[PDB]
């Protein structure tokens, strides 16, 4: 299936995922498409920061759902 991720810079991307993919898997897809490192990624859906070990299904993230990406900024 496909889901959407809106990045921190406001860019909406598409991802090819299965409901049994883990949030960690998703972050790795985002690193492969957009170059953003998983260590910086905070994936968010319906007011919750998603947990790496859980799956998209665990959060009831359905086809064409839109996740929000906020970044961890150090310096």
């Amino acid at each position: 299936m496909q889901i959407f991720v809106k990045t921190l810079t406001g860019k909406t991307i598409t991802l090819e995922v299965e409901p049994s993919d883990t949030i960690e898997n998703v972050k790795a897809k985002i690193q492969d498409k957009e170059g953003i490192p998983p260590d910086q990624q905070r994936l968010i859906f319906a007011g919750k920061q998603l947990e790496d070990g859980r799956t998209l299904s665990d959060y009831n993230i359905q086809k064409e759902s839109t996740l929000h990406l906020v970044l961890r900024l150090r310096g």
Binding site: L8, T9, G10, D39, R42, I44, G47, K48, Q49, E51, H68, V70, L71, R72, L73, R74, G75
Partner: protein, 164 residues
Amino acid sequence: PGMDFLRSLDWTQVIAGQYVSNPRFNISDYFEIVRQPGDGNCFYHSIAELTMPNKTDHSYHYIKRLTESAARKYYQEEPEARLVGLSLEDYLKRMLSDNEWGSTLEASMLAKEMGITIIIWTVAASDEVEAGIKFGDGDVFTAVNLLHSGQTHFDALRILPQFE
């Protein structure tokens, strides 16, 4: 109308008390940049610059202690603390060590601890704004504004007078 622009920023609350914005502009067209030391403490220097009367190179020490207090109060509930992967006690030792970097985590807790709004403006090498992340319900005029640059550095920002 200059300040109308800033007052009209579009903030999406993605998580409680945390907002994102995607305006496009040169940081220097609306803000004065106040450069901070190139040690490991720039995050705390930057906050100090904007929160403490007569700030100096040692003022940051007080913000680091505010961070400690805020952490004891907020760390274990902070969603972003999950990326740090440290017990509250281990984190405190690490955070308090000299020249340890700060981040969006410390910003979130300090906003709560200090009762203020903190905004981190992240920019490209060209100093164009990619995004702002806001901790607190305040608007840009009332906020403590930081500039995150080079993916590794914080400076302080003050709104330019004509937009104040």
